[PDB]
């Protein structure tokens, strides 16, 4: 839900750490035209813990959404944003012609057109050096065989679907980030198989008589056996 997106050559990177990730806000949204995950399942992501998650965001043409994928080639995949062949994450895209196209033509969004060699995976090239396409050196001056390496998208509303701006978010999964792992209600005076914060067992949970300290969680009898627990939600000892 960001207001401004970056040009693809200068793609933005947000580092996400130490938080409970609710992926349901994403795969249950009908506002996405492209949503492809690699090496992971979209619905099975709320049950996986990762050390770091990277969200990269930029703007490209609809024609070039196909290039944001492992093992792709093209002006974007080679010279702007490259995914590795072993990519583990998700690519999400949606049309933004209503936001990123101006009537007279939007020229704030750019892409790299000239580069001597292809980008390595997750390479961010923001150079403005004049591209030496000829035998003679450029010395930072434009002219024949000396071109500005960036080219401007011409995002107009009258453009075909393939030429309208699409906003892209690439999630990279690399533990401080886990998924929700919701809970349920608890019942007393009935034999239950229970799993509290880190422990699991079978037994009957009853109202207790002990006074646990504010930082104590799991009880223990004399013979190293679990005796009482602190309910994670309700501050009651069972």
């Amino acid at each position: 839900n960001a207001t401004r997106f970056a040009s693809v050559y200068a793609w933005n990177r947000k580092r996400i750490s130490n938080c409970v990730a609710d992926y349901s806000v994403l795969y249950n949204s009908a506002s996405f035209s492209t949503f492809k995950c690699y090496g992971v399942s979209p619905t099975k992501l709320n049950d996986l813990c990762f050390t770091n998650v990277y969200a990269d965001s930029f703007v490209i043409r609809g024609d070039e959404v196909r290039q944001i994928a492992p093992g792709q080639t093209g002006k974007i995949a080679d010279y702007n944003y490259k995914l590795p062949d072993d990519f583990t994450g998700c690519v999400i895209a949606w049309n933004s012609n209503n936001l990123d196209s101006k009537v007279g033509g939007n020229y704030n969004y750019l892409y790299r057109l000239f580069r001597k060699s292809n980008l390595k995976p997750f390479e961010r090239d923001i150079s403005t050096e004049i591209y030496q396409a000829g035998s003679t050196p450029c010395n930072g001056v434009e002219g024949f065989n000396c071109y500005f390496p960036l080219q401007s998208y011409g995002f107009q509303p009258t453009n075909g679907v393939g030429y309208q701006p699409y906003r892209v978010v690439v999630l990279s999964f690399e533990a401080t980030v886990c998924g929700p792992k919701k809970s349920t209600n608890l019942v007393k005076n009935k034999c239950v198989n229970f799993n509290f914060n880190g422990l699991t067992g079978t037994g009957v949970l009853t109202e207790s008589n002990k006074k646990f300290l504010p930082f104590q969680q799991f009880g223990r009898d004399i013979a190293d056996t679990t005796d009482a627990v602190r309910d994670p939600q309700t501050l009651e000892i069972l």
Partner: antibody, heavy 116, light 107 residues
């Protein structure tokens, strides 16, 4: 002195091979977008292959798997390796520095490849 | 793959007459359409690039306009040395495709 000079065309039996050399002057081939375009006798123009500045190769469906495009930086020469040649590959083969910006679009003069 | 259609196939006009040919695209190609002039035997020569922009050195009598899917190529006043076959090509989307061609003869 910007110009493209190409050679290597001639007669070749079907299923045979033939490499077309396109020597350049005035710019660097390994830094530009280069293209091969063939024109059958009496017909229109037909795009064949493209090499990017970074090296990515793209081919047309009618020659995919059979034709190969490459370049040599030391000689500043664009090549087109043609294998499993067919009778419908007979054409004039122009090499061209692809248009990308104002006035860099320049075509060779083509060489006659005759598969018979 | 995109398919460019070029009308008319052939054409003959007097010296000085306005000559106009069209090139309809099968898909939207924005304004990424170029125009080539191929005199007999010689290689194609780029005249119009990006639908409407004149390549440096082309006489002013050559024109180009259009965006999206319908494009036009206009000769202001036809000249005798303008006899050639003119093609249209799109290049932004792969594969690169050409038009059918238009042969031009002097009356």
């Amino acid at each position: 002195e910007v110009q493209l000079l190409e050679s290597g065309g001639g007669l070749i039996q079907p299923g045979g091979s033939l490499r077309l050399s396109c020597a350049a002057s005035g710019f660097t081939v390994s830094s530009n977008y280069m293209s091969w375009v063939r024109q059958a006798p009496g017909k229109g123009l037909e795009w064949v292959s493209v090499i990017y500045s970074g090296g990515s190769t793209y081919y047309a469906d009618s020659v995919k798997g059979r034709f190969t495009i490459s370049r040599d930086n030391s000689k500043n020469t664009l090549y087109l390796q043609m294998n499993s040649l067919r009778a419908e590959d007979t054409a004039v083969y122009y090499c061209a520095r692809d248009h990308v910006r104002p006035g860099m679009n320049i075509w060779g003069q083509g060489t006659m490849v005759t598969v018979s | 793959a995109i398919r460019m259609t070029q009308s008319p196939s052939s054409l003959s006009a007097s010296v000085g007459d306005r000559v106009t040919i069209t090139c309809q695209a099968s898909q939207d190609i924005s304004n990424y359409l170029n125009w080539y002039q191929q005199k007999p035997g010689k290689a194609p020569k780029l005249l119009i690039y990006d639908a409407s922009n004149l390549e440096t050195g082309v006489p002013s009598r050559f024109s180009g306009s259009g965006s999206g899917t319908d494009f036009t190529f206009t000769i202001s006043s036809l000249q005798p040395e303008d006899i050639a076959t003119y093609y249209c090509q799109q290049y932004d989307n792969l594969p690169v495709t050409f038009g059918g061609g238009t042969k031009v003869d002097i009356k």
